[PDB]
Design a protein around this nucleic acid. Structure first.
Ligand code: ZN
Length: 65
RNA sequence: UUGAUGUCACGGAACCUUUGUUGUCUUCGACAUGGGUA
């Protein structure tokens, strides 16, 4: 879970409005800590939650190839 | 030409069955051609 001096929480992969999602994850998620995910109203998010884009508005946007 | 907090599709052998095989003496004789003369 270390990345530089920071440590990543488990991320969040849990959506209440399931029917929005065309696909749902069937595989298990890899684990590295017992700690809970970052709060949904936090200001500061760990690097994994930045990569997830959880921090019309994107933080990391992938274009098509 | 995607939409985003969730994609094991490297998650799936074009695989399985089917005889290029059955039948046949390297033999042997009468035939071609269209008129001619009253
Ligand atoms: Zn986090």
């Amino acid at each position: 879970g270390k990345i530089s001096e920071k440590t990543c929480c488990p991320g969040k992969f849990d959506t209440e409005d399931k029917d929005r999602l065309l696909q749902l994850r069937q595989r298990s998620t890899l684990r590295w800590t017992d700690k809970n995910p970052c709060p949904d109203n936090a200001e500061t998010y760990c690097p994994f939650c930045e990569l997830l884009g959880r921090s019309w508005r994107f933080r990391i946007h992938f274009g098509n190839l």
